[PDB]
């Protein structure tokens, strides 16, 4: 038990030569008599002795060994943010969600201590940030900044999306994507960013509109009046964004709650070139609104001429 203490000391201090002189199949998984009662692997992991960790693992150290608190060496690596140690342990089969006596996982420890880098690693290896410790608190609950909380949430949703795709779980893919911010709806009037972008008076509105669509915005989204972005753009003669909507397959004949197309609204506002653009995109001038009107029947003579030309 005198050589044991020397071995544990070699592990804590990173003394490779002394470790290998003292390490045998009989003491590789010994515990300290006092303190945390760590194994050499606990010590090497907690004090970031990468090389010692590798040699212990090569010579039979048990990644599931416990200390006085139920910690495995992964807890020690993660709590102190030693990235490389953490990955080696995981490579040699450490349980990524191992629980100590208080049901803290390695992720609890890394998040608790603001070890951002290690949390991402743990999540890539299947760490569940929803698992609760004995106080019902999850790892996200323990992240001390809102930046880490949003990152933990992002990465866990990322990995969850990949698994659901592997299983062609249409319901779950559809679920998570619905909570993406690209389709956020204004609580009262239900417009999306795409409605707001095509109505903008600022000169980057075309590039914003293109970006939103590239990132998944629904080109035919209805607001509370069932207006699409095309309706909003057409009644304002924002022709530049209407071309973007068309290129992304906007439905030219979608109907608002009055049964009106985008072309009805362009004709009502008297926007001649807009009417022309809409016709060239395949707007159907024959559609009758719920109040009984075609576009031409709502427009002035110049509008009626455009629809006739």
């Amino acid at each position: 038990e005198y050589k044991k203490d020397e071995l544990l000391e070699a592990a804590r201090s990173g003394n490779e030569e002394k470790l290998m002189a003292l390490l045998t199949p009989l003491n590789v998984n010994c515990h300290a008599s006092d303190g945390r009662k760590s194994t050499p692997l606990h010590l090497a992991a907690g004090y970031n002795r990468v090389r010692i960790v590798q040699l212990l693992l090569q010579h039979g150290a048990d990644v599931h060994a416990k200390d006085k608190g139920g910690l495995v060496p992964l807890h020690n690596a993660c709590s102190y943010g030693h990235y490389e140690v953490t990955e080696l342990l995981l490579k040699h089969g450490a349980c990524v969600n191992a629980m100590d006596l208080w049901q803290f996982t390695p992720l609890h420890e890394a998040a608790s201590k603001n070890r951002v880098e290690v949390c991402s690693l743990l999540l890539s290896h299947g760490a569940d940030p929803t698992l609760v410790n004995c106080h019902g608190k999850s790892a996200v609950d323990m992240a001390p900044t809102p930046e880490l909380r949003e990152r933990l949430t992002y990465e866990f949703k990322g990995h969850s999306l990949l698994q659901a795709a592997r299983e062609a779980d249409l319901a779950k893919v559809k679920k998570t994507l619905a909570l993406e911010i690209i389709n956020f709806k204004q609580p009262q009037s239900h417009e999306t960013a795409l409605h707001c972008a095509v109505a903008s008076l600022h000169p980057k509105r075309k590039q914003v509109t293109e970006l939103l669509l590239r990132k998944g915005a629904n080109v035919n989204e209805k607001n509370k009046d069932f207006m699409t972005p095309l309706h909003v753009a057409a009644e304002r003669a924002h022709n530049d964004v209407m071309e973007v909507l068309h290129k992304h397959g906007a439905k030219m004949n979608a109907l608002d709650t009055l049964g009106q197309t985008a072309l009805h609204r362009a004709a009502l506002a008297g926007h001649l070139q807009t009417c022309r653009l809409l016709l060239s995109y395949g707007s159907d001038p024959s559609i009758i609104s719920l109040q009984g009107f075609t576009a031409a029947q709502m427009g002035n003579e110049a509008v009626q001429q455009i629809l006739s030309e």
Binding site: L43, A45, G69
Partner: peptide
């Protein structure tokens, strides 16, 4: 509940 052996 103490902490585990190690250092940051």
């Amino acid at each position: 509940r103490g902490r585990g052996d190690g250092q940051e």
